[PDB]
Curated annotation (Swiss-Prot), chain A:
<feature type="binding site">
    <location>
        <begin position="127"/>
        <end position="130"/>
    </location>
    <ligand>
        <name>S-adenosyl-L-methionine</name>
    </ligand>
</feature>
<feature type="binding site">
    <location>
        <begin position="213"/>
        <end position="214"/>
    </location>
    <ligand>
        <name>S-adenosyl-L-methionine</name>
    </ligand>
</feature>
<feature type="domain" description="DOT1">
    <location>
        <begin position="13"/>
        <end position="321"/>
    </location>
</feature>
<comment type="similarity">
    <text>Belongs to the class I-like SAM-binding methyltransferase superfamily. DOT1 family.</text>
</comment>
<comment type="subunit">
    <text>Interacts with MLLT10.</text>
</comment>
<feature type="modified residue" description="Phosphoserine">
    <location>
        <position position="288"/>
    </location>
</feature>
<protein>
    <recommendedName>
        <fullName>Histone-lysine N-methyltransferase, H3 lysine-79 specific</fullName>
    </recommendedName>
</protein>
<comment type="function">
    <text>Histone methyltransferase. Methylates 'Lys-79' of histone H3. Nucleosomes are preferred as substrate compared to free histones. Binds to DNA.</text>
</comment>
<feature type="binding site">
    <location>
        <position position="177"/>
    </location>
    <ligand>
        <name>S-adenosyl-L-methionine</name>
    </ligand>
</feature>
<feature type="binding site">
    <location>
        <begin position="150"/>
        <end position="159"/>
    </location>
    <ligand>
        <name>S-adenosyl-L-methionine</name>
    </ligand>
</feature>
Length: 322, 320
């Protein structure tokens, strides 16, 4: 009774919200999530926008049970008419819808954000601010096919994995996280994501979010067999950084690493004193949405693309032999 | 016990005290310093060449010496470029303006709790969607030096500052009645003018004033305004009614951009609704989703004063 229901556009189980509606933060709540969900479904199903009496999307009071109920009811009646129309007569989400889905999955999953103990700009709590856009730019730049295996080393609550799995056709996407609190929230993010993606009728690639230490023996062979590694190594100490380079040194030719800090200098010059360095077996480039034909107006951020290339070491040895 | 950033145009340096201020749970002045440096380097290519690249990768925001080293490397690069230019003002890019407006807010609104604003239109979240929707609005209405822009209920003045940085309107006004945002708007104004000079960026003339937009003085001022911006989403029926009476004195082609329409989108003039504001204005819903938008599914409303709607009704009665 004391609740609001939104029918799924594809006939999945309805989204059920209790009344009073949950509040996510000081300026964000479930009332706005309901309005935006309705708007997104109408935007991408044009018959639905035609069927719905749209005056309610102007005339609404988020603090009134009756007003919010009438808004949900108009949308649900329009869903029923469209289901009748389709009776008589499964794609990847757009970037805009995926941004909404990921936020919605986070709001239903991470109920106590204080527990994360994350005060850095890479916190799950601010993922929608810059990270989502930079991951979308990364997806467009780093071409992935069904022959690729994607791994996020230290995946937090799994946001990058969910975004990449919704956008690409990699064979599989993995997220590995060590810390207890984020790996526990990742279990809910996983269930909430699959549920919401089915509610919208959207496709995603296969993915797994797992609890683990990416420096373990099991993960050594797994990194060696990964074609695309994503790693937020910005705050990693020298030991972890060193151990990671040792793991990357076992990757196949053409294997790629995308990171927030470079693992080798951008201007690496192979000599007799730096033959041990990872720079001898990889090309490194700085990718910035500020560079190119990209219409970027966000933060002046960059990421780094590393590609395993053993010809740098091979050519130096030929120079030494001849 | 401080950090200094030299201006790329030789204005007074930006001075930050140490320990560096914290703005929120994930945002501080150390990130502001780094991003300021990155923006100046991005838009001055010789600067990016002169500066040692490692400096913006290996930094510790919690170390005075590390942050001082970072500022020093940028200041030395500014000095080399100033020497290069010795040896022989534009508008900010959208990206730089977004950074400038956040920076102006960070230095001005020290106690955001005081605003008592829990709505999505709060100054505290302006950079999230409002900034992008205002940028879309500026591209859509295409104001010239003959225009006068007025934001009715301007809060801390963010819309006025954005519009004045982007357009060549003769003047931009913000009028705010509430004490706390009107007081913060005075600081936003000073900080904006200072930061714009620091970057060497141009803006149009603007005034942020404390006042009641329903007063007699404002009645004549609204009548002489060519572009009104108003966030009327939470306005009661009395304010809404009084505003329509103000808009009814505007000139033909006068425009009102708002968060809620002042007249129905499907208004049809008849003998029973001749009193309605819909008889003298066109109304259209503008949505960035219609027409590369991936943000929130938001809309705003454009009203254009057009008394020919009323006139055609009378001429249609006399010419059946
Ligand atoms: C951890 C969640 C995330 C993300 C997106 N991202 C970046 C890179 C630099 C940034 N700088 C500042 C602020 C951000 N939010 C940044 C995000 C990223 C990419 Cl695209 C490739 C490889 C690693 C990373 Cl971490
Ligand atoms: C007050 C600060 C602002 C702004 C930009 N804006 C809107 C309009 C609808 C919105 N919907 C949801 C969320 C937002 N942030 C929205 C912002 C706006 C415009 Cl472009 C024209 C006329 C009035 C308005 Cl209020
Ligand atoms: N050895 C590790 N194995 C898996 N995740 C890790 C490990 N070390 C750090 N992390 C995680 O990496 C993330 C930062 O990239 C954080 O969420 C942090 O908990
Ligand atoms: N009569 C008025 N005069 C000036 N500002 C007002 C008036 N009424 C409301 N406001 C302001 O309009 C804004 C609502 O967008 C608030 O900042 C609020 O204080």
């Amino acid at each position: 009774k004391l609740e609001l229901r939104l029918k799924s556009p594809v006939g999945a189980e309805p989204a059920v919200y209790p009344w009073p509606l949950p509040v996510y933060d000081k300026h964000h709540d479930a009332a706005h999530e309901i309005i935006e969900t309705i708007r997104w479904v109408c935007e991408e199903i044009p018959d639905l926008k035609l069927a719905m009496e749209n005056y309610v999307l102007i005339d609404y009071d988020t603090k009134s049970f009756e007003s919010m109920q009438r808004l949900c009811d108009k949308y649900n009646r329009a869903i029923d008419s469209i289901h009748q129309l389709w009776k008589g007569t499964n794609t990847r989400p757009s970037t805009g819808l995926l941004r909404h889905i990921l936020q919605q999955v986070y709001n239903h999953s991470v109920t106590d954000p204080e527990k994360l103990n994350n005060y850095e700009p890479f916190s799950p709590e601010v993922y929608g601010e810059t990270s989502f856009d930079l991951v979308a730019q990364m997806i467009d730049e780093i071409k992935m096919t069904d022959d690729d295996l994607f791994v996020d080393l230290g995946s937090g609550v799994g946001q990058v994995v969910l975004q990449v799995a919704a956008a690409t056709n990699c064979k599989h996407h993995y997220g590995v996280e060590k810390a207890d609190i984020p790996a526990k929230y990742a279990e809910t993010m996983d269930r909430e994501f699959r549920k919401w993606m089915k509610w919208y009728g959207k496709k995603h690639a296969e993915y797994t979010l797992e609890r683990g230490d990416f420096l373990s023996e099991e993960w050594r062979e797994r990194i060696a067999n990964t074609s695309v590694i994503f790693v937020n190594n910005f705050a990693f100490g020298p030991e972890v950084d060193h151990q990671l380079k040792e793991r990357f040194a076992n990757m196949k030719e053409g294997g790629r690493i995308v990171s927030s800090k470079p693992f080798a200098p951008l201007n690496f010059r192979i000599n007799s004193r730096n033959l041990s360095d990872i720079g001898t077996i990889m090309r490194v480039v700085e990718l910035s949405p500020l560079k190119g034909s990209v219409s970027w107006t966000g933060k002046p951020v960059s990421y780094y693309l590393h590609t395993i290339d053993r010809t740098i070491l091979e050519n130096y040895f030929s120079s030494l032999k001849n």
